[PDB]
Amino acid sequence: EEGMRVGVDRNKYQIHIPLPPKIDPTVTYSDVGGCKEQIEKLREVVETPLLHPERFVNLGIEPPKGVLLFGGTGKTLCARAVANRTD
Amino acid sequence: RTRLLDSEIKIMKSEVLRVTHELQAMKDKIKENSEKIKVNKTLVSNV
Incomplete structure (x- = not known):
């Protein structure tokens, strides 16, 4: 592989x-x-x-799976509060 | 039809000339083209 x-x-x-x-x-x-x-x-x-691909799939909208974040704002602290929640 | 014998001689001559072209081209091309490929295979530059 090159x-x-x-x-x-x-x-x-x-x-x-x-x-x-x-x-x-x-x-x-x-x-x-x-x-x-x-x-x-x-x-x-x-x-x-x-958790629930139903609020969108059945809705036909897509599951929100990305964020265009922009900002002492806390770009990591948000990812860690997510780490509390992703799994 | 006496010229038919001379025509057959000339046709055998043309066949021998085509075979000689075949030799000088393909046989020598084995060597020449093989060296060219070697240079190509065995191992980029600007005009």
């Missing part, structure tokens, strides 16, 4: 036994109720598809 440091001949440069020695080490809630209005939309988008 973008991998693969084994390759020293003379003919034909591909040989590969390896990605670049490996995994590259990537690193009582606050439920914060900025008020945000809480309900977050709750819906997270749980209602995770």
Whole structure:
């Protein structure tokens, strides 16, 4: 697969036994109720598809499954209040 | 029809010439084209 440091001949440069020695080490809630209005939309988008694909599927609308958040706002604290709730 | 023998001689000559073209082209092309492919296979640059 292109973008991998693969084994390759020293003379003919034909591909040989590969390896990605670049490996995994590259990537690193009582606050439920914060900025008020945000809480309900977050709750819906997270749980209602995770819990009840009926409020939308039967409604034909789609399960809210994403958020275009924008903002000391707390972009992580919201994700953690969700971690209280996702599972 | 006396020219038929000379025509047969010329036709055998044309057959030998086609076979010689076959040799000089395909047989030598084995070598030449194989070297070209080697350069292509065994191992990008600007005009």
